[PDB]
């Protein structure tokens, strides 16, 4: 009647933390997409010069 309550409160706090952690990974993951993005640009800038001196 009551023991069940105190158990759900704990169960809910577990779900709450599992969700918080997954949020953190998405945050990290988007941060990594930003890096990937600024990296593909530098890779492109780095390629044009090379593919031009050979467009013979």
């Amino acid at each position: 009647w009551d023991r069940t309550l105190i158990e759900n409160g704990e169960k809910i706090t577990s779900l709450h933390r599992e969700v918080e952690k997954v949020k953190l990974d998405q945050k990290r993951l988007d941060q990594e997409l930003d890096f990937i993005l600024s990296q593909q640009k530098e890779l492109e800038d780095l390629l044009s010069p090379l593919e031009e001196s050979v467009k013979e």
Partner: protein
């Protein structure tokens, strides 16, 4: 008796799990975009390495 604030919290948790799924979808679409761009870069650099190595032999 906190049976009412448990259900509120479960709405909040369920509300956030939804938002999570929406994020997974979108960034699925971003990985897909970045993988396609990467294949183009990989090819082009290979060609350069090819045309460039053909230069060596002569």
């Amino acid at each position: 008796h906190m049976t009412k604030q448990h259900q509120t919290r479960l709405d909040i948790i369920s509300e956030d799990i939804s938002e999570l799924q929406k994020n997974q979808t979108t960034t699925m679409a971003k990985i897909a975009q970045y993988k396609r761009k990467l294949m183009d870069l990989s090819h082009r650099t290979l060609q350069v390495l090819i045309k460039q190595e053909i230069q060596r032999k002569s």
